[PDB]
Structures are given as structure tokens and as C-alpha cells.
Design a protein around this ligand. Structure first.
Ligand SMILES: COc1cccc(CN2CCC(C(N)=O)CC2)c1
Ligand SMILES: COc1cccc(CN2CCC(C(N)=O)CC2)c1
Ligand SMILES: [Cl-]
Ligand SMILES: [Cl-]
Ligand SMILES: [Cl-]
Lengths: 695, 697
């Protein structure tokens, strides 16, 4: 059910043992010694990884190591589509701007922070959640020359439970992390966008890296002299596999949850956030689809933009399904009413006052938040020419010395980035007409961004004429129109340019709304501190976990499927057969790698097939995971690696507000399939040899 | 494999059925010399199955079977199609014009009689052995001269079975006064509508109620106000015990057609010509229609039914090609024919090998012709609406070239033009579809094989298909209403003789008929060889584990109530519930709108005796019975022969079941009788229908 703090392992150990856990508590997490926790890393700031060998080998998702594989890919060696398999440690590719963070120590500093907070004076100061204030407190407790006296280490204090608990983290950061192996994109992204958020799933979502360090194993930036890290702890790979109901656990860095939302916040998330995103993205995607099907060149140009738009669109559909069918609003309402009833018995009205404060703030920011979401979904991300070039104050005070040619070159570079190989003005005009028509229907004249008032005032309500006029008269409407400006550039022309005026006024309103809405976050956060304090004082810190905040958490459950709808059951495990069933040679998402197809046909599964002779691919578990858990190690009852978490089913996106026992499942790639791809697809035997594999 | 058995075969199948769960006596299910459950089964309206469920002639069939009858009695004031219909008295039951119910009174094996009559062989290559005309003359001879007059209500019919190796005579009793009694709203009767068509799980309450009327003596009589309900020989008892997983289930009904005895070459031909051309051509047509329907809501209204109709045989061809590819249908037919050829060699009789070779050589020889026929039929005949534009008749042409009969010809042509360019026809949409269909057609059919008018694409329009289609509408009398009226005012035969749309329609129909006439001769050697082939298969494996092809005659099938795994890690159970209806509810989608009375019954858990032990309300179930089109409305029976549901569909994974039964995929989709009774009771409030049925606890 939860995303538990490492501090809570003691309090949860008995339940985990009853659910199947066999390893000793301190072998999983030891607050003052070495444990399995020491083999978990925060990979590249937003993913999880795990050390799987005594030479610093690291496994994470394919989508986690994707940018690294893409950076080293060229026309000659396209590692993204064919995979990459360094046959020696010297061949492993270094990555610029990469990091791996070990959580060396975790300490409860609640009383220390609460005492330091007493010197604030302003009762509504947000310093209790300020990373700047909390870093000054972390530096004070660690020492003045802490990072110099402890090379590789750094400290950090994070707030938990809306400011009711504080933990200090001692982090060891390594920045020389090299690409070691990666399956082809056909395996690493098999489902691609169709199977995104979907169970059953047949994706071999993994990539291999290695941590490098100085001769003493201390963190060091990339140097040819760097040597593999001999870590204090690494995971053993289990070949025993999984069976239905088997205990499974995960350690990783879940990014964010909203477990303590009020019922009013759930209504707001549905009726504003999700409904606007769903409505606006449906209009945008509809026009893009019409155009992509009509012109194969437009399909090439807009495929990635269409897929990107579909991602949060699908998540919003899934979230609204949970609000409607799983009774999320009602359960939050029950939670707050239960607290208010208890507070009345205790003679303490501050909890009821706190829920009322959140409710009144949500009610007050409703029209503002609606306008912000309307402009963000409708214009900022909905219309490409909203992100067209806007001349800087320096550029205009250069056009009106001969640094006029420098200004035109700077504007030309931004214009080339906007009107690139993937940009179509005709498609953008069509999308803009449909998005603006919907926007003007929902946003009244008095609340419109200044330039959009011209639709009524100058164009007699003709949206198509207004959009046509923007491209016809603008210096960014076509290459010829830009070059004509570039030859005779006058500041007067830029000041009255219809596309510049549009982009400027839509961004003015977007920032104006953001600045008006920002003040409303603080009374809610302050009230949430009282609200969560009451919930914890009433039900205890045993059956309720703190919201995810990109810190190390553990979760446990069982390998199990679920019934998505009446008369349908989705089992706990997918197989290689399922990959072959989904094969479509004329669909880039479902193309099957020839070496993998041959392995399947020849039944060349070695020691990686299950007892029935079927090759496993992925499995699902009742663990509680969210974004940030990508690449998280999945463990056995004995703490051996059984797979890597890579997704969560769409029926479980609402799990960020309320865990859904009968629907929510973590989508994990079976470690047996990972080793099968390394062995029979990459032929990288040296990686299997350095891992500690248990039969 | 699992059959559609003749009633004659019940005796030799009875032991297996008993072992599989059957508890009733053989002659209580079918008796050649007495009353049996067979007497409660009817052929409803010529292409559906029905069943008598009361001693006053009450009949249950599907909602899609009684659909046209419900639509005919519906008006703006009383829309029975939308809200349902529930006659609260027998006098309120609505009569239907052109309706029928056929009872199979007797079935008799007349093989030796037909085979003896056939020996008066003028030509050994005569197809009289399969001729309905010749077989009706033989049926009349055996029954007697003036049998229909001497036996009011009865008629006789002889059908060929096993490619001409078995013949049965059927004595049919036809009733033509069949009145609408009850029907659920379309929201229940067609819940899935087109989305859930061929789909399991399924949550559709596909049923409608009718009543057979007859004269005072129970004899067939056309509609008369004096007609009285029929007191049937036998009727089904309704079981409320329900179904559980693995329970024995059986069905009686009229499966229309199968091709169980196709050679491997016939399976290749069906895939590579029939299905591949239908899939390719319908995909192009449907693609253009979709683009236009989404762009203009008026075009969506006009083309919705045409789009859905095209999608029907398209989905079937996709499903059929899936089975050929994944279920090894070609290989299993090849194994069947090789097994026979090996046995024939051991017996010293080469006629079976010679017969398979004959089929194979004929299929090979007609390949280019059949490809061209399918290309023009899918591509132009069905694909382009202006191919079915008016063609002036021989008499119409002659009339316009010295009497008032000139105005009669223009009125006849105008009526056909109005039928073509109707409220649902869009010339602009038709031009766009034609350009895409013709471009694909011209790519596959070489110049020398093109219909004469299509040669102008290369010769006159420099390959510009769009210009050729534009020219047809610009210069044709049928290109617009104004263009027709201008012709109608000053009509000359010269104008019609050189009309580009008339020349197109004539030219495409001339090639369509020329190909049909060239292909027709090839059917006969295959049919004649199939008689030898099936005769060999029967002589070798016996008439025990192989059934004859479906031919719209009464058959029985049995299996178990069971689900299946459609794909890796997915299982579809044996039973759907009312909960599944509620999960699928979409108030803004006409297909998934839930009836308010039904939603409240669900909310109030007002399920009476119709719920299962767990208190859940069942809706539909699936079984391993072997059914095909024609089995719609078929009664589904218990181990004791009590009605447990009505068959209404088959899953798409089982469309290949018409060539080879697919044990692990093919399932009959049946509406649970408890849900039927729930809708009658709590939605229709028609208690009198429940009272007249014999319901077992
Ligand atoms: C196939 O359709 C459905 C839908 C819902 C429930 C079931 C029955 N369950 C299947 C497997 C499950 C398990 N835990 O293994 C227990 C019972 C089947
Ligand atoms: C969704 O998970 C799958 C997929 C395919 C097969 C199975 C195995 N079980 C199916 C159902 C059967 C029963 N209930 O009769 C028992 C065996 C499970
Ligand atoms: Cl370490
Ligand atoms: Cl012979
Ligand atoms: Cl099968």
C-alpha cells in the first residue's frame, strides 16, 4: 500500500515477514552499517538504478538511459536502434552530465529543525519548506568544511508529512557513469506509445551502465585514469524466477504523490486540471491526426509531438477514471470528516479550521486556475507559433552601431529553431484555429490575452482570418517573409508584428496568472501541516506513509494479476510468445528484433526459461510505485534481484492519491529476460560472468 | 471438428453426449416417430432460429432477428425500437406482414431413392444431383401430387448433404401469422451495437418475443382477426438453475454455411484472393469514408450505414485470415487430404487422389480470372457508388428514338436516378472514394484486362485518375440534379449513348459479367470432385466424428460452458454480469447508453430469483458449441433439455470455425435466460409472459 521511509522498516518488518520476507531487517536496511540499501542509486536525477556486480555494474530502464544511448548514436553506429554492447571495459562510453547518487546515511533531524524554526517569529513563514533554509541547517549540523573533510559526500534536509518530519541524507555522488550495454529500441521500447501505461506488457525496458571512480573508489569526474567502482554492496541476480503470490519488494525514489489531498482538491484536479487537459489535447491531437494521415511527410514531422501530447492526455483519462469509479473524492472526504469528528471530541478545532482553509483557498483560486490551465493547454503547449521568436530588449536596442547584423543573426537562429524540419505552418494554422476557437469560447473578452481581443474587435469573430493574418503579415510567417525583414529590419516592424504581439501577450497572461496563483499555494501548505499532523496524531505513523518527495522509499507486495473489467483476468506474467503475437513488421512500435525472433523459434532460452519451458518477459506486483521508480530493483523474499520496475498500469495512475489494491500494479521486466537479451541478443558474456548469479 | 450434427446422428452421438453431461432420454430430444424437444425449434423468418417456450405458442428469438418487425411498428409517437414493446394482453400483440415460422415436422433419409432416380443419367457430368429444381420434382414425386392441398400447412423439401452423398427430405409446417409480443429497448437488445459485434466478453440482452397464431384447429393460417394462439406439440421449459463453468450445454438450430471439406488449395485461394482483395479494397474505401465523415457531420449521417456495412465483411475477412495464419487451417486441410490419398493407395482406389488433383488444378487454372473478378467486385461494383448509376434499358433506349412513351422512359430513368443520388448520396464523397479505389484498381489490373471505359485513363487523361473522375461528373447527365433536368427537358439517345457515367457503369458491369461467365464453368468440376472426395473421407473415417457442411437445415451441437485465453496473459471467463453493463455505460455514446429502469434494478439489487448464488446478476455466457450464421436465436439447453439461454453471436476468433472448428478459441455467445426473464419482469413488467412459461426452480 505504501512508499515507506527507511526509518519505518522496523515498524513494518513483522508485516513483511508475514507476507513472505525471509532476509534479516539489517541486511535490507542498516542505519549504522552495510545493507542492500547501499546497492540502490538515484540514476541521473529522476530514475532509480542498482549495482549488480563488484565492479560497479548498474542496471536501470532503457527509457532512463535513453538520452545517453541517443547521444552516442550516429548514422554509422546507431546504438539506439541496434543496441550497444561494449566487449571490454575500455569500450564503455563515458557520459557528460550524468550522475549516480548513493544514500550513505539517513538521519531523523525533526527536533533539530523544529527547534531552529522557533527562531522565525513570522508564524506564516515558509522557511520550514525552503530548500535554501534547510540547506543552511544541513550545513550547520554537518559541519563547515563537511564536503572537504568527507570527499564525495554531501548533506541534504528534506521535509516530510507537510513539515512534520525532517530527515537529513548523506549522499555520495559519482559523475563518471559509462554506458555498458543496451538492447535495440525494438526490445527496450517494444510497446512504444501503444503499450505505454499498459498491462499485459512485453517490453525489455533495460540498459546497463558502470560507475567509475578514482584509484581509491572515491567519486571523480570523467578521467581516462578512472577505474571501475568496487562497491561495498551489490545485488545478486536470482534465476529462480517468480510464481503467482510470491513476495516482492522494491527500493527506489518515487517522485510525488498527493495522499493527503482534501476532497475539494480531488474535485479541482478532476474538473480543472484533468478536464481541461483532456478537452484541449483531444482538439490538438484530432487536428494532428487528420494531417498526419493525409500527408506521410506530416506524419514524419509530427509523430513525436503527437506522441508527447498523448502521454499526459492518457494519464489524465486514467486519473479521471479512478475519480469516477474508485470513489477517490469520497474516501478523502471520509478521511477529513473522521479527523474533524476526532478533533471535536478532543476539543481542538485547528484540524477542522485547516480543512476549511484548504477548501476556501481551492474555491477562491478556481477561476484563476481554470484560466491558467486553459492558456497552458490551449495556447502555450497547444499552438506552436506561441513559442515563436520574441526579440529581446537588447536586440531591439541594437536594431534602433553595426551590431544590427548580430541581432538579425540571433533572431534568425531562434526563427530556424521554431520553423525547423518538423514544423509545418499550415498544420500549425489548422491546430491554432481549432484551439483558439475552443479557448475564445471558454475565456471571456475581459480575461483574454490582449492580442486575442482583435478576434472580436478587428476580425469580426473570424478566428481563421485572424490566424491567416498572423502568418500573412508576420516576419516569422515564412522564410521569404523573414529574409525580407532581415534585409530591411526596422524596430517599428517588430513592435507591430502580429506573431510577435500574439506570442508576447499570450506569455504575459501566462506569467500574470502564474504570479496571481502562486500566493494561494502557501495557505494550503500551512494548513496541510496541521491537517497531516492531526491525521498522524489520530491514526499513527504505522498504516500511513509520507508523500513521495524524490527520496529513497521501500514498498512491498506480491506478484499478482488483476481483473480490469467484468469477465476479464490479466495474469501476473507475460512471455516471449506475447511479443511474437504482437509482431507487426509494418508498425515501428511492434517490429521484433531478428535475433530475438530466432531465439524464440529455436527455443534457445538456456537457463532463463521457466519450469514449463516458456520464456518470461515481464511480471506485475501489488507494490506501490510512481514516477521516479523507473529502474527500481525488484527483490525476492531473500533480497535477490528478480526484475526491474519500469511502469505502472493506467488503472493505477489514481494511486498517486489513493492506492488501488484491486487495480494498481507495478510493471516489472523479468531479470531472466534481461539476462536472455544480454546473452543471446548482445552476446556480451563478460556482463553475465561478473554478476553473482544464484541458481 | 466439433460438429453441427444431423438429427439422424443423435443415436451414434448419444453415448458421447451422456459422458459429457447429457441427462435426458435420446427420444425426448429427437424422435423420428414421435414428439420430442426438436418440435419446439423453429426457423424464424427464413434466416434465424427461434423456440416455442409456452403452451400458447410463445416464441423467443434474438433482438436482431425480430429487429425489422419492431422497426415496422415503430413511429415518432410509439418508438418501440428505442423504448421496447410489451403487449399487456394477447389482443395487443402486433401482427407482422411477410413473417414466417417453420417447424421441422419430419426428417427422412431419402438417399437410396434419390441415388436410384439419378441413375436415369443422360450425362454423368450432370449437376442435377445438386439442383434445387430437380430435387423439388423428386420431393413432389415421393410426397405425392397435390400434397400441399391434401395436407394444409405442410410442404416437402429434399436437400443434398456431404457433396451429394446423402439426401434428406424435410416435412415443413409453416405458420405465417407470427405476432410481436415483447422486445427490450434497443439499449438492451443491442447494447454493444457495432463496437461489441463479434466480441466476447459481451453484455447484450439480444432477445425479442413473438407468438404463433393459427386457425381454431391449430393449422397454419395467414393473418386474420379470427386467428387464435397455437397450442404447440412441444415447448421448452425455462430453467432458473443457471450455468456454472464446465456445465454441459447443447443447441438446436439452422446453421447456414460451412466449408469443412475445403482442400488446402481452396484455403490458399480464400486467403490470397477472396480475403486479401476484400481487406485491401475495403480498407481504401473505409479510409476515405472515415476522413469525410469526421470532417462533415452531415456526411457522417449519410454514410454511417454504408461505412458500417462495408466494415462487416471486412472484419470477418480479417478474423478469417487470422485463423489461416495462426491456427494452421491450410496445414490441417492438407493433412486431411494426404491421409485420404494414403488410404486410397492402400485400398487400390486412385479416384480420391484424382479428385483432390482435379480441385487443385481447377483452383490453379481459375486464379487470374478469380483475382480480376474480386478486384472489380470489391474495387468498383461495391467500392464505387456511381458504378450502380442508371443505365438506360433496351426498351428505354428504343422509346426515346415518336410517342408519349418518351415521357414514360424519362420518368423511369428519373426514378432510378433518384434512388442512386438519394438523401445519403454525396457526389463529392463518391468522387474521392472513386479516385482512391480506381488508383489501386489500375495498379493491379493491366490495360488489356481493364473494362473498356477505364482504358481512357491512360489514353485520354494521361494517367490522371482525378481528371477522368472529374470529367465523368462534369459531363454526365447523372452528375448533378441540374444536369439531369437539362437532359430530361431535351432528351436525345445520342446523349445517353456517349454519357461518361453511363459508359463507365456499362463497361464495368460488362467486365463483371464477362468474368462471372468465364468463372462459372470452373465450379462444376470442383463440386463433382468434392462428391468423390467427401465420399472417400466418409468411407475412411466414418460418419461419426465428421459432420456434413451447414446448409440451412436443423442441426444439433454440444459442448461446455467455458471461457478461453484470447492472447498471452489474458483470460476471458465463461460468464458476463450486469456489473459489466454498468462498467461499459457511456451516456454520450448511443451504443453504450444504459436503460434507466435497468440501472435502477442493478442499484437496488432487484434481481429476484434470476441472480446466481453469489447474488450477482448474469447477462451472457459462452460455450464450446459449434455455431455459425443462421444459429441466431437458437435455444441453448441444460443437461435436462431446459432452456438456459439464446445463442446470438460467435467471437471473431471463431470465424475461421466455418472451415475448421477452433477448440481453444471458438465460443458461441449466448444471452442467459435469467437475464431475459429479468428484463421481461423488471423492465417490461410483462408478468403474463412469465406466468405462461413453465419455469423450473
Ligand atoms: C477470467 O475472468 C475472470 C474475472 C474475474 C475473476 C475471475 C476468477 N479468478 C481468476 C484467477 C484468480 C487468481 N487469483 O488466480 C482467482 C479467480 C476470472
Ligand atoms: C489470465 O491468465 C491466464 C491466461 C491463460 C491461461 C490461464 C490459466 N487458467 C485459465 C483459467 C482456467 C479456469 N478458470 O478454468 C484455469 C487456468 C491464465
Ligand atoms: Cl558504495
Ligand atoms: Cl477408384
Ligand atoms: Cl484452436
Amino acid at each position: 500500500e505504501g512508499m515507506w521511509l527507511m526509518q519505518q522498516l522496523g515498524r513494518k518488518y513483522a508485516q513483511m515477514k508475514e507476507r513472505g520476507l525471509k532476509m534479516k531487517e539489517y541486511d535490507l536496511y542498516n542505519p549504522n552499517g552495510t545493507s542492500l540499501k547501499d546497492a540502490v542509486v538515484l540514476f541521473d536525477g529522476g530514475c532509480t538504478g542498482e549495482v549488480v556486480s563488484d565492479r560497479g555494474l548498474v542496471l536501470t530502464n532503457h527509457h532512463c538511459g535513453y538520452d545517453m544511448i541517443q547521444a552516442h548514436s550516429t548514422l554509422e553506429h546507431n546504438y539506439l536502434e541496434n543496441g550497444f554492447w561494449a566487449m571490454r571495459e575500455a569500450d564503455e562510453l563515458p557520459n557528460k552530465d550524468i550522475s549516480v547518487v548513493f544514500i550513505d546515511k539517513i538521519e531523523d533531524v525533526t527536533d533539530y529543525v523544529k527547534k531552529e524554526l522557533k527562531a522565525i517569529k513570522d508564524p506564516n513563514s515558509m522557511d520550514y519548506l525552503s530548500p535554501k533554509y534547510l540547506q543552511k541547517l544541513a550545513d550547520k549540523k554537518a559541519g563547515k568544511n563537511f564536503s572537504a573533510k568527507n570527499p564525495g559526500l554531501s548533506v541534504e534536509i528534506k521535509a516530510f508529512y507537510g513539515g512534520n518530519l525532517y530527515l537529513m541524507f548523506t549522499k555520495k555522488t559519482y559523475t563518471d557513469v559509462r554506458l555498458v550495454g543496451a538492447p535495440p529500441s525494438s526490445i527496450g521500447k517494444f510497446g512504444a506509445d501503444t503499450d505505454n501505461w499498459i498491462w499485459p506488457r512485453h517490453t525489455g525496458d533495460f540498459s546497463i551502465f558502470r560507475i567509475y571512480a578514482d584509484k581509491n573508489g572515491n567519486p571523480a569526474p570523467y578521467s581516462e585514469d578512472n577505474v571501475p567502482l568496487k562497491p561495498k554492496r551489490f545485488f545478486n541476480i536470482s534465476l529462480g524466477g517468480v510464481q503467482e503470490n510470491d513476495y516482492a519488494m522494491i527500493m527506489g525514489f518515487p517522485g510525488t504523490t498527493h495522499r493527503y489531498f482534501t476532497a475539494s482538491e480531488v474535485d479541482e484536479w478532476k474538473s480543472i486540471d484533468n478536464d481541461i487537459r483532456i478537452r484541449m489535447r483531444d482538439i490538438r491531437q484530432g487536428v494532428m491526426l487528420r494531417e498526419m494521415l493525409a500527408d506521410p511527410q506530416i506524419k514524419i514531422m509530427y509523430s513525436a509531438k503527437y506522441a508527447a501530447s498523448q502521454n499526459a492526455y492518457k494519464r489524465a483519462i486514467g486519473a479521471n477514471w479512478a475519480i469516477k469509479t474508485r470513489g477517490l473524492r469520497q474516501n478523502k472526504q471520509a478521511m477529513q470528516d473522521r479527523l474533524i469528528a476526532w478533533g471535536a471530541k478532543q476539543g481542538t478545532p485547528r484540524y477542522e479550521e485547516a480543512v476549511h482553509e484548504i477548501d476556501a483557498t481551492v474555491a477562491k483560486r478556481a477561476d484563476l486556475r481554470r484560466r491558467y490551465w486553459m492558456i497552458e493547454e490551449g495556447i502555450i503547449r497547444g499552438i506552436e507559433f506561441a513559442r515563436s521568436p520574441i526579440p529581446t530588449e537588447d536586440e531591439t536596442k541594437a536594431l534602433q552601431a553595426s551590431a544590427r547584423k548580430e541581432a538579425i543573426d540571433k533572431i534568425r537562429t531562434r526563427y530556424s529553431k521554431f520553423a525547423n524540419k518538423d514544423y509545418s505552418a499550415e498544420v500549425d494554422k489548422k491546430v491554432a484555429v481549432a484551439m483558439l476557437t475552443e479557448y475564445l469560447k471558454e475565456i471571456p473578452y475581459e480575461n483574454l490575452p490582449l492580442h486575442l481581443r482583435l478576434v472580436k474587435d478587428r476580425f469580426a469573430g473570424d478566428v481563421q482570418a485572424y490566424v491567416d493574418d498572423i502568418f500573412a503579415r508576420s516576419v516569422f510567417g515564412s522564410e521569404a517573409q523573414f529574409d525580407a525583414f532581415a534585409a530591411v529590419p526596422s524596430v517599428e516592424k517588430l513592435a507591430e508584428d502580429p506573431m510577435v504581439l500574439f506570442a508576447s501577450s499570450v506569455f504575459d497572461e501566462y506569467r500574470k496568472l502564474y504570479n496571481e496563483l502562486r500566493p494561494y499555494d502557501d495557505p494550503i501548505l500551512r494548513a496541510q501541516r496541521t491537517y497531516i499532523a492531526g491525521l498522524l496524531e489520530m491514526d499513527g505513523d504505522q498504516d500511513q506513509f509520507p508523500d513521495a518527495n524524490l527520496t529513497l522509499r521501500f514498498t512491498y507486495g506480491q506478484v499478482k494479476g488483476y481483473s480490469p473489467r467484468d469477465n476479464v483476468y490479466y495474469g501476473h506474467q507475460t512471455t516471449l510468445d506475447g511479443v511474437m503475437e504482437k509482431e507487426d513488421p509494418d508498425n515501428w512500435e511492434f517490429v521484433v528484433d531478428p535475433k530475438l525472433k530466432a531465439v524464440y523459434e529455436r527455443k534457445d532460452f538456456g537457463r532463463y526459461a521457466d519450469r514449463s519451458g516458456r520464456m518470461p518477459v515481464a511480471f506485475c506486483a501489488t507494490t506501490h510505485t510512481t514516477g521516479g521508480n523507473s529502474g527500481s530493483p525488484v527483490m525476492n523474499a531473500n533480497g535477490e534481484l528478480i526484475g526491474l520496475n519500469f511502469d505502472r498500469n493506467w488503472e493505477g495512475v489514481g494511486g498517486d492519491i489513493q492506492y488501488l489494491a484491486d487495480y494498481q500494479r507495478s510493471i516489472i521486466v523479468d531479470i531472466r529476460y534481461v539476462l536472455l537479451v544480454i546473452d543471446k541478443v548482445g552476446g556480451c558474456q563478460r556482463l553475465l560472468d561478473e554478476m553473482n548469479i544464484v541458481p
